[PDB]
Amino acid sequence: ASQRGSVDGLGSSLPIASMLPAVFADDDLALRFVAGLDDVLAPILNVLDCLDTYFDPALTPADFAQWLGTWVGAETDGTEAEPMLRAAVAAAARLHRVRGTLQGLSETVRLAFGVAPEITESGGATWNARPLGPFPGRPRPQLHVALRLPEPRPVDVHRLDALVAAARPAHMPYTVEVT
Template identity: 85%
Template sequence: MRGSVDGLGSSAPLGPRLPAVFADDDLAQRFVAGLDEVLAPILNVLDCLDTYFDPALTPVDFAQWLGTWVGAETDGSESEPLLRAAVAAAADLHRVRGTRRGLSQAVRLAFGAEPEITESGGAAWSARPRGP
């Protein structure tokens, strides 16, 4: 779990947004300063929310969750670079799943080796049950 940053300022402090009658009220300013301290981490995450959905930039714990969200086939024991690569490749791998290209990409991602696939991809079929 990620911790908080001490002294993190709010990107949108509430004090200046109060009505003029509360601008010089010390109690109101201290109260909203407390709210600013509580809301600062949330607002800072929302300010850079797009980076949380980029596998290369997101924090590792969020990358693991993002992997479950996009269907990346990970087991939690892979290294951080491999996890990020699996999350980034998940959509393309699902698109080509079951094809020679998809199998090749999955093996390359999981083992780091270039596979040699010799299956032709051809299939025999018949309109009648049990064949011709």
């Protein structure tokens, strides 16, 4: 479950007493008792007041952060730390616009480890005004990922192996090197 319910010491934007008629608002027991009913309805009005915040990934409770992952397919699995999820879901939509792009591949690994990589890609981009001029680019495909981790625990090679597996465009080989 989630262990939600009532919250002590929370006010309401719609006091029950404030909607009572005049003259009725003069009693001691009626005003105190009917204000007690505000306790049960207190947190519902908070939700409707701040429903917009309940959708921003940077602020919503942890449960909805994973749910907001399935909103736009953010790869929520495998992470057992809340702060790691916080960046992933918000930055997921930007990544999917550059899947298979040098910046996109570099950012994804950077996103999952916190440090920028040092990649070399088999090719590039260069023009030439010469008619039917030759185009350079490495003769054979090759993808390499280098990570400058400070504390290379011997599990990051597999983690980089799994992570870069989806980033590569199912087209060319690859290798994983971790500091």
